Structure 1
Amino acid sequence: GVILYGPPGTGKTLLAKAVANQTSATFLRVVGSELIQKYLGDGPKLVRELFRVAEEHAPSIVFIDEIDAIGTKRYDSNSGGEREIQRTMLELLNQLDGFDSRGDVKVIMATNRIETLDPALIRPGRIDRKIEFPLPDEKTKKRIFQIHTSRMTLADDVTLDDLIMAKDDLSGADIKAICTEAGLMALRERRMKVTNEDFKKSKENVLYKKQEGTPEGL
C-alpha cells in the first residue's frame, strides 16, 4: 500500500483520482468520517464489506481518504465512541495484512496529518511506500496557474509572474481558489475578459483567510 501524506491542498486526492481514471481496475473511494457509524458494530461491518467486494472484482484499488479521522495515535485514556473507532481500526489493520492472503488488491491512503497515525497501520508490511507531498515552490506555481487560467479569456496585461513571485507559501487549492474568484468578479463586472488587477485583488482577498497571532510564535 501507498500512504499519501502532506500539507493540506497539495495533490493527494487528485493523484489518486488520476491513477484511478487511468488504470484498468475497479477503484473504490471512502471517507474516514464515513466509517464512524452511529450503531455499534457497523463500522467494522462496513470495512469488512469494503474489502469483501474487492476480491469479487478482479484487480481492485481502495483509497481511504482522510483516514486521520479514523486512525489516530490510539491513546488509551479516552471515553465514548472512540473505542468503536479503535475497534474499526483493528478491523482494517487485520484486513490489510492479517491471517489470510489479501488476494489481488491495493490500498492507497491519504492523511493531511500523519504524525498522529497508529504505528501498526502504517508499518512496513501494511504500507510499504510512503509519499511526501510538498507545496509548489516557484515554478510548479506557474504550471498550476497556467493550468487553471487555461480556459478563460484574459486581458493582455496579466502579470502572472508578478502574482507568483511572492513567497506567500501558496497552496494548490489556493491557486484554484484564486482562479475561480478572479473569474467570478470578472463575471460580476460584465467584462468580457479578466484583468491583472482583478487577479491581484482576488489574491489579496483569498489570502485574507489566514488569520492567527502575528508576533506570537515569531
Structure 2
Amino acid sequence: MSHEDPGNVSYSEIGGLSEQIRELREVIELPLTNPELFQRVGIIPPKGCLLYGPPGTGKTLLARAVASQLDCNFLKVVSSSIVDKYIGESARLIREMFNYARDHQPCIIFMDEIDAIGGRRFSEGTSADREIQRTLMELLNQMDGFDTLHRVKMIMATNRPDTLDPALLRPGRLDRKIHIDLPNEQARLDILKIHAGPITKHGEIDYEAIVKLSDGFNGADLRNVCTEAGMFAIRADHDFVVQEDFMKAVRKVADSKKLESKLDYKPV
C-alpha cells in the first residue's frame, strides 16, 4: 500500500524520451479523469505494457511515476514474492495479491525483473520451470476475466525480452514495447535543470562542460558526477569549485564507467 512516486512534473522532467512521456500520460492517468473519450470513439486502452532496457535509463521510472499519478491507487509487486517456498502456495497469493489489487480502482499492476520468474520453456529443465508457468497461469487467469480488464493496466519489465516465450512475446498479455534513447544538444541544458536540485555550485558557471563529457549515462550516474565533483569540494575546503577541477573529476570517473558499459546489446 505504501508505494509512492511523484509527478506529473517529475515524470515529465526526466528529459526523455519526449514522446514516451506523452505515451503513458494518456494511456494510464487519462482513463480515470476522462473515461468518456475512449468509449465514445470506440478505441480501447491497452491492457498491458512492457518496458525493457538498459539502452540508457528509465525502464522502471517511466511506468513508475505514472503509477501513482493515476491516483493514490497503486499496488507494487516484487519478484521475490512469486518464488514462495517448497510446494509454494503463492499460486493463491498471486490470486490474493491481485484480489486486493482490485480493491484499488482503477487498478495498476507492476512486474519487475521478470527475467528471473519468467522462466523459458525452450530447453525443458527441472519442474521449477513448470511452477514458473503455473504462477504465470495465476497471472493470466484473473487478468483474463470475466472481471475488470480494460480498466486495469498491467506492466512488466525485463532485462532482455527473450525470456517472455511466444506467449508473453505476443501482445495481449504484454502489449507495448518501448526502449530508451539518448538526449540531444540544447536539450542537455533541459535535463540539466532538473538534475540541479539540491546540489548547488558557484554563481558564474556553464554546466555544458559537465554533462557533455559524460554521454550515454544513467540519470543517477550524471547525478553521481555532480556529487563526485561536489565531494571533491570538501578536499578543497571550499563550498564551490572552479570548473577546471570539475572537468577533471567529471572526465576521469566518466571514462571509467564506459569501460564497464559492455553488454549493452539487447535482443529485439
- Structure 2 length as normaliser, TM-score? 0.66
Name the structure 2 match of 1:77.
Answer: 124
Q: Which amino acid aligns with 1:100?
A: F
Question: After superposition, what is the alpha-carbon deviation per residue over 1:77-103, rounded to whole angstroms, capped at 9, x for unaligned?
Answer: 322633332321232233333x53344
Shift of 1:55: 1.8
1:16 counterpart = 2:63: yes
Task: Note if contact 2:210-2:250 (Cα within 8 Å) is conserved in structure 1.
Answer: no
Task: Note if contact 1:135-1:171 (Cα within 8 Å) is conserved in structure 2.
Answer: no
Q: Distance in 2 between matches of 1:193 and 1:110?
A: 40
Q: Distance in 1 between matches of 2:184 and 2:158?
A: 21
Task: Note if contact 1:7-1:135 (Cα within 8 Å) is conserved in structure 2.
Answer: no
**Segment of structure 1 superposing worse, 197-206 or 62-71:** 197-206
User: What is the RMSD computed on CA atoms of the aligned residues?
Assistant: 3.0
Name the structure 2 match of 1:26.
Answer: 73
Name the structure 1 match of 2:233.
Answer: 186
1:201 counterpart = 2:249: yes
Shift of 1:161: 1.7
Question: After superposition, what is the alpha-carbon deviation per residue over 1:114-166, rounded to whole angstroms, capped at 9, x for unaligned?
Answer: 23322212422223322222233445543333322233221246442223334
Taking the TM superposition and a 5 Å limit, the aligned residue runs for 1:55-70 are: 55-70=102-117
Distance 1:209 1:79, change over 3 A: farther
Percent identity over paired residues = 47
Q: Which amino acid aligns with 2:252?
A: E
SS at match of 1:52: helix
Q: Which amino acid aligns with 2:198?
A: R
Question: After superposition, what is the alpha-carbon deviation per residue over 1:35-88, rounded to whole angstroms, capped at 9, x for unaligned?
Answer: 222232234233211211122233111111222221143334322633332321
Q: Which amino acid aligns with 1:208?
A: S
1:116 counterpart = 2:201: no
Distance 1:140 1:114, change over 3 A: farther
Taking the TM superposition and a 5 Å limit, the aligned residue runs for 1:1-218 are: 1-7=48-54, 9-24=56-71, 26-79=73-126, 81-97=128-144, 100-103=146-149, 104-156=151-203, 158-166=205-213, 168-196=215-243, 197-198=245-246, 200-211=248-259
Q: Distance in 2 between matches of 1:188 and 1:152?
A: 17
Q: Which amino acid aligns with 1:154?
A: K
**Greater share of strand:** 1
Q: Which amino acid aligns with 2:166?
A: P
Q: Distance in 1 between matches of 2:186 and 2:155?
A: 28
Distance 1:145 1:40, change over 3 A: farther
List gaps (5 residues or longer) in structure 2. Answer: 1-47, 263-268
Q: Distance in 1 between matches of 2:234 and 2:261?
A: 35
Paired residues, what number? 213
**Greater share of helix:** 2
Distance 1:147 1:37, change over 3 A: same
Q: Which amino acid aligns with 1:113?
A: R
SS at match of 1:63: strand
Distance 1:107 1:87, change over 3 A: same
Shift of 1:27: 0.9
Task: Note if contact 1:7-1:134 (Cα within 8 Å) is conserved in structure 2.
Answer: no
Q: Distance in 2 between matches of 1:114 and 1:7?
A: 12
Distance 1:185 1:49, change over 3 A: farther
Distance 1:56 1:171, change over 3 A: closer
Distance 1:188 1:63, change over 3 A: farther
Distance 1:168 1:213, change over 3 A: closer
- Structure 1 length as normaliser, TM-score? 0.79
